[PDB]
Design a protein around this nucleic acid. Structure first.
Lengths: 836, 49, 57
RNA sequence: ACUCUGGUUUCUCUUCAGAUCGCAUAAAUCUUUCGCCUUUUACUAAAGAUUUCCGUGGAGAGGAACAACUCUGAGUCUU
């Protein structure tokens, strides 16, 4: 037990890896198998899964992973060295993608679980893309291999074909996102690992070759494995591995030596327990007692596979050989994550992962105890050692080297290492580990950087947790008894801490809206709020999605606004942005941190813009990565440039505020290009102050946006459904009812199930999963993820339309409804006032 | 069917099918039955209805 | 009341999607308990049968 | 490749039952709402509390079976 703590001293014998994959791909089962291997006293029941690493009531009852769970455990290697592994058991549901990222940011490596029968599916593609964004090491585990044997009964040649197709698809997808070709994946390379987590099968080519060696002896398992995949064949006449089949009907080496023994060992346990099982069991050296042979097929198969494949050394050596240790893998983590960069002295100190260096931890997880009134931080120690009962200085998401307000001095009490449900308390934690921290819940909100006080005062924070999806679902939440409103308010804070991507916002009318990614996400959020945090009755409004605001035509005339001093006059125009350019800003293709030459070169070359106009670009939209552009257009022949630069910043904040809250839908102006066509700046500094210019900038932005014919963008979800062939026609009709257009319908290779990918409006996507599941009797299952904002049918500025209450209006009316009711939800006016 | 239902035809319609068969049932108390895959598959094929 | 009133019915649906439930083919090889196999064979849409005969070489 | 290992079945009894006692499912009493309502006896249907009943597992004790060596394993078991 003490060796578990002592192993944290060595920064190379620790691997920080996150287990990610699609929904129900054996990740939790794999962690359960690892726990059973390392914990003698923990055993799953014969029919019910172990359900270890899932501690929430919702996790067990729903059966879907909710909260990423930390597992620290010591596992022997293939050679026999006990390494230390920290695992993020992450939810596979796309709606909880944020829960992956919080564990993904502090993870050196990624283990991608893919179901053998299912295929890649959607969340796996999104996961590999996003992990490529953090440039993490990538390993692939095709779990549930037994489903190719015990379910589809595919011939071993076809099983190899399916596995090779899946591996090639994963490699192509990675090559489509990652420029570095070093991320190629192959079982011979130690990247691809095969497994069936239900029966405790976990082997790579090296592990199986080592099994062969221990069976016979004097065998180089490494070189044997390096010839155990692909179009290689084996000749028993010469005992030699060739690139061509020695005979005509010969089988490939992978089939001959790996898939074939697995097929037979499964078949002799599923079909011939009483007839032929003892012979093949004595053949392989597996000795089962008379009682052990009396178990049912599944527990007996799990037991025999546990006895045969032994330890899970394939996973261990995969992670050791392909996932860098924190000591060596810290440098890319600092390069991509830290705001100050590796160039600074702190960057150099934290790149070395020095246990004796300056204290620095990065907390990205919050865990609720039984009471729920005191959260526990969870994060990676990137430098130094944190000690129990020690003063620390916690920074915030908005903290900079100037603003010291966001920090706070907190005493850290007892701290522990979380092994799923049970955590081991430790006096201190060296660098590179994953640690639970107590006593820092109050100043920590979502992402947090913790450092030591009275030293390293030039310490910045890590970049805020970036999420793959844009949370568009919005539900208003109110208390049943307003006399108990504060409690619910308190509960809100708790959920805002617990769920990384949860956004709780109080609107003007007093409605506390909550932003969620999908139906299940908000369902679990409100279950936690009612049953665990608030413990009081709550009320939900009808779900509704957010809306963005855009323009489709050039502003008819230049719109002007003036300061209350009547001396600064700003006149602007409104135009839409180019296709993909908004997506380019969204994906950080081009950033405001770029020097003017690079951004100008991008704009003029790729998008055919004028060089002067490209140099005339001032700022981006609602945030630094906002999809709106603010561009100077004052001609130098009439307007001074240096004088304009004094109020350029104030106009920038004004435009950012205007894009944040749109005049039409009260928020989120998207895909709009604004050009300042006239600037009259008062010659004295006191007549051009920010408090004077920023409201004027907001007013002129509103006038320019409203003068041009506006449009409402509703979020379109990209929904792919995996369903049998007979249900495809029904899915077509169900998608047609909810105003969704079908894009693709591809039968899954190596499986009789089609996959239909379509786009459905998010506002019309509520209950779509339940509708499709119940309409096809559970055969068709769907997952929804945000894809792209699209123009809603209708004109938001056509007042001749009358909105019939409690009736689904036709498409030409929708936009009007979609804004008017939205205004009623904000407490705002009935109609947008063009004058204001 | 003499060919499909080979293992169960002997004892299919007895009052207690295998009561004195010590291999399959512990004893006369007729508890804790132990079967084999062929007879279970035969029973399933018969009971598909 | 020996029988049951028709008003007690719960499967009253204004939605055609729930009025017409997509029957499960059970991979073209499963059969619902009770019903004779021949009637289900001559009743099933045989979409899977058509797919099999198209993929039968 | 060895010496000792000592059965399993069945009939009872006595306690404990955590666990779907039971991959099944009853009734009664009481207390709340009820529906009928007009007096008991039947009731309407939900919640709550016990209880009895058809069963069950384990442990311990006492028989018979009935034989019996062994099974099995402690190991040096050997070429």
């Amino acid at each position: 037990m003490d060796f578990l703590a002592d192993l944290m001293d060595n920064s190379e014998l620790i691997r920080n890896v996150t287990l990610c994959g699609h929904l129900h791909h054996g990740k939790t089962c794999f962690v359960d198998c690892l726990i059973e291997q390392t914990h003698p006293e923990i055993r799953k029941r014969y029919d019910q899964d172990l359900c270890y690493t899932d501690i929430l009531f919702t996790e067990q009852e729903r059966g879907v992973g909710i909260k990423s769970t930390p597992v620290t455990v010591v596992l022997p290697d293939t050679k026999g060295k006990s390494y230390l592994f920290n695992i993020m058991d992450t939810p596979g549901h796309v709606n909880f993608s944020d829960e992956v990222t919080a564990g993904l940011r502090i993870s050196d490596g990624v283990v991608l679980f893919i179901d053998a029968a299912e295929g890649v599916m959607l969340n796996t593609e999104r996961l590999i893309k996003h992990a490529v964004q953090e440039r993490l090491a990538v390993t692939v585990c095709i779990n549930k291999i037994d489903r190719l044997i015990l379910e589809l009964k595919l011939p071993p040649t076809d099983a190899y074909y399916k596995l090779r197709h899946i591996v090639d698809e994963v490699n192509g997808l990675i090559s489509m996102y990652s420029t570095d070709e070093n991320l190629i994946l192959s079982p011979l390379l130690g990247n691809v690992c095969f497994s069936s987590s239900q029966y405790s099968i976990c082997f790579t080519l090296g592990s199986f070759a080592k099994i062969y060696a221990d069976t016979f002896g004097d065998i180089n398992y490494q070189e044997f494995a390096k010839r155990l995949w692909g179009d290689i064949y084996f000749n028993p006449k010469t005992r030699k591995f060739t690139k061509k089949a020695p005979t005509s009907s010969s089988q490939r080496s992978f089939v001959e030596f790996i898939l074939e023994p697995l097929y037979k060992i499964l078949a002799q346990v599923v079909g011939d327990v009483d007839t032929s099982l003892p012979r093949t069991l004595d053949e392989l050296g597996i000795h089962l007692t008379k009682e052990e042979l009396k178990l049912n097929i599944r527990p007996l198969l799990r037991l025999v596979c546990k006895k045969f494949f032994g330890e899970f050394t394939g996973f261990v050596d995969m992670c050791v050989q392909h996932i860098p240790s924190p000591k060596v893998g810290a440098k890319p983590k600092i390069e991509h994550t830290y705001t100050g960069g590796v160039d600074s002295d702190l960057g150099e100190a934290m790149s070395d992962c020095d246990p004796d260096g300056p204290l620095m931890c990065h907390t990205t997880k919050m865990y609720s105890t039984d009471d729920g009134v005191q959260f526990h931080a969870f994060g990676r120690v990137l430098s130094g050692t944190i000690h129990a009962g020690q003063p620390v200085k916690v920074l915030g998401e908005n903290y900079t080297l100037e603003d010291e307000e966001d920090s706070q001095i907190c005493t850290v009490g007892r701290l522990w290492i979380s092994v799923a449900r049970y955590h081991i308390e430790v006096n201190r934690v060296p660098a590179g580990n994953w640690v639970l921290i107590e006593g820092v819940d109050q100043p920590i909100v979502k992402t947090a950087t913790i450092t030591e006080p009275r030293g390293n005062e030039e310490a910045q924070i890590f970049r805020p947790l970036k999420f793959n999806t844009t949370s568009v679902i919005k539900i208003a939440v109110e208390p049943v008894n307003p006399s108990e409103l504060p409690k619910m308010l308190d509960g809100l804070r708790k959920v805002n801490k617990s769920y990384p991507s949860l956004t709780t916002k109080v609107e003007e009318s007093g409605e506390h809206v909550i932003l969620g990614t999908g139906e299940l996400y908000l369902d679990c959020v409100m279950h936690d709020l009612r049953k665990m945090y608030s413990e009081i009755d709550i009320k939900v409004a009808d779900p509704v999605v957010t809306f963005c605001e855009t323009v489709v035509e050039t502003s008819s005339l230049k719109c002007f606004a003036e300061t209350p001093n009547k001396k600064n006059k700003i006149t602007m125009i409104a135009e839409p942005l180019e296709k993909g350019l908004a997506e380019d800003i969204e994906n950080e293709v081009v950033q405001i941190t770029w020097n003017r030459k690079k951004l100008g070169e991008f704009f003029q070359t790729k998008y055919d813009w004028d060089l002067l106009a490209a140099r005339s670009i001032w700022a981006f939209g609602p945030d630094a990565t906002g999809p709106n552009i603010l561009v100077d257009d004052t001609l130098p022949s009439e307007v001074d440039k240096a004088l304009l630069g004094s109020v350029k910043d104030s106009i920038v904040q004004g435009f950012q505020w205007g894009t944040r809250e749109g005049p039409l839908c009260d928020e989120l102006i998207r895909n709009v290009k604004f050009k300042i066509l006239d600037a009259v700046v008062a010659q004295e500094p006191l007549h051009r102050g920010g408090g004077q210019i920023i409201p004027t900038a907001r007013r002129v932005v509103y006038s320019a946006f409203l003068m041009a014919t506006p449009r409402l963008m509703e979020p379109y979800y990209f929904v792919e459904v995996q369903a049998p062939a007979d249900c495809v026609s029904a899915v077509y009709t169900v998608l047609a009812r909810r105003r969704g257009h079908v894009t693709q319908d591809a039968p899954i290779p190596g499986s009789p199930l089609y996959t239909i990918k379509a786009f459905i409006p998010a506002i019309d996507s509520f209950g779509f999963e339940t509708d499709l599941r119940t309409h096809t009797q559970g055969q068709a299952f769907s997952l929804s993820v945000f894809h792209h904002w699209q123009i809603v049918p209708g004109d938001p500025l056509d007042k001749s339309i009358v909105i019939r209450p409690l009736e689904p209006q036709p498409a030409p009316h929708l936009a009007r409804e979609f804004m008017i009711k939205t205004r009623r939800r904000k407490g705002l006016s009935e109609d947008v006032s063009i004058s204001k | 069917d003499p060919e499909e239902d080979a293992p169960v035809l002997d004892w299919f319609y007895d009052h207690q099918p295998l009561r004195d068969s010590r291999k399959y049932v512990n004893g006369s108390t007729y508890q804790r039955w132990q079967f084999t895959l062929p007879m279970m598959s035969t029973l399933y094929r018969l009971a598909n209805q | 009341v020996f029988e049951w009133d028709a008003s007690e019915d719960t499967s009253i649906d204004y939605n055609p999607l729930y009025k017409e439930r997509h029957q499960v083919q059970l991979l073209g090889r499963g059969f619902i308990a009770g019903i004779d196999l021949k009637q289900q064979k001559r009743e099933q849409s045989r979409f899977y049968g058509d797919l099999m005969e198209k993929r039968r070489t």
